[PDB]
Design a protein around this ligand. Sequence first.
Ligand SMILES: Nc1nc2c(ncn2[C@@H]2O[C@H](COP(=O)(O)OP(=O)(O)O)[C@@H](O)[C@H]2O)c(=O)[nH]1
Ligand SMILES: Nc1nc2c(ncn2[C@@H]2O[C@H](COP(=O)(O)OP(=O)(O)O)[C@@H](O)[C@H]2O)c(=O)[nH]1
Ligand SMILES: [Mg+2]
Ligand SMILES: [Mg+2]
Lengths: 171, 171
Amino acid sequence: MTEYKLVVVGAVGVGKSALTIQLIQNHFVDEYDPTIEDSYRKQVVIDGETCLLDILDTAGQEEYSAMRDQYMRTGEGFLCVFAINNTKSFEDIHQYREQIKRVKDSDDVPMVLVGNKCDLAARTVESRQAQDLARSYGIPYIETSAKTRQGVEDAFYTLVREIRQHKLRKL
Amino acid sequence: MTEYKLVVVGAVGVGKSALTIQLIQNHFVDEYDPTIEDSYRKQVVIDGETCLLDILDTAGQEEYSAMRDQYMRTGEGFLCVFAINNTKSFEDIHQYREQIKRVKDSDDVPMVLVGNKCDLAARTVESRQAQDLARSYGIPYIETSAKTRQGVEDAFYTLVREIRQHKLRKL
Ligand SMILES: Nc1nc2c(ncn2[C@@H]2O[C@H](COP(=O)(O)OP(=O)(O)O)[C@@H](O)[C@H]2O)c(=O)[nH]1
Ligand SMILES: Nc1nc2c(ncn2[C@@H]2O[C@H](COP(=O)(O)OP(=O)(O)O)[C@@H](O)[C@H]2O)c(=O)[nH]1
Ligand SMILES: [Mg+2]
Ligand SMILES: [Mg+2]
């Protein structure tokens, strides 16, 4: 069926692995080797289209750029994630977004901005600032929580839909 | 009288020198040595307070950081400017804003975002994206044109007022 190659990107400790794993196997995982980078797949039905999700769970020292090259130029969409209680991870969103536009020759590649850990009752980054950023970038912003699972399907599926619109726009 | 040390910052070719000079001597200047970095002063009355504006017109290769050190930690406010028809200068706004927060130990230093050259009927950066960015940063955005002079006083004076509020907030 159709196959979407997605890449999950963002600073270390934001919850990239917990989100990915929550999506694939429905269980929250804590303590998962910060170093391990691997792909994950799942057959899903989104909006009636059945498809294959090919997700790259990025890890490793790569100064805010292209963690896993031959997925990065080939990724069809990216999940830019930050933790809602870590302003740095948030401030670093710009750099990830610039390497992505950099290897892909465009400021028009499907992405979604993800504010993770919204279960934490605390916060150093607030909803309106994130969403203004997204609004300036032109992409959606969605808050999730790998822990309670809130928003994880909405985040990945919202990313699929963007890719879809983007493929239909060339006709 | 009161004295405000302001720094004009941004990529080369955006109009930092034309704006500064337009403010100080009311005349548009084209072709002004991209390399020359110097300060400029003017006595003005803003909101009934008479004051001395001490402006640093930043120039020189300094990778998006602290052009003129002993003005940068001492600047009381910064004018972050980009050209409305130069998306790169615009995308680089983040880096300037991070060195400023970097030498000043805070994500709370008076700044104003300036979209210059609004006389050009063209544009690669649009009003709503700039303002969403500003809104996410928490600072004002003002469009100016060193050429026709539109907005140049509003930009500097709006920067003075921010500094004022910021000084009054400690009481
Ligand atoms: N409270 C809470 N902790 C989370 C959430 N997402 C991830 N974590 C924890 O944050 C840390 C980093 O998660 P991980 O997926 O390994 O981060 P990564 O470096 O982006 O892969 C671990 O302690 C996770 O269990 C979340 O939504 N809520
Ligand atoms: N049309 C137009 N050109 C401008 C404007 N501001 C500056 N320029 C021109 O842009 C170039 C760069 O100006 P300058 O102040 O030297 O740029 P800087 O490197 O930021 O100091 C010169 O050609 C200026 O005359 C503006 O508002 N409108
Ligand atoms: Mg991980
Ligand atoms: Mg100059």
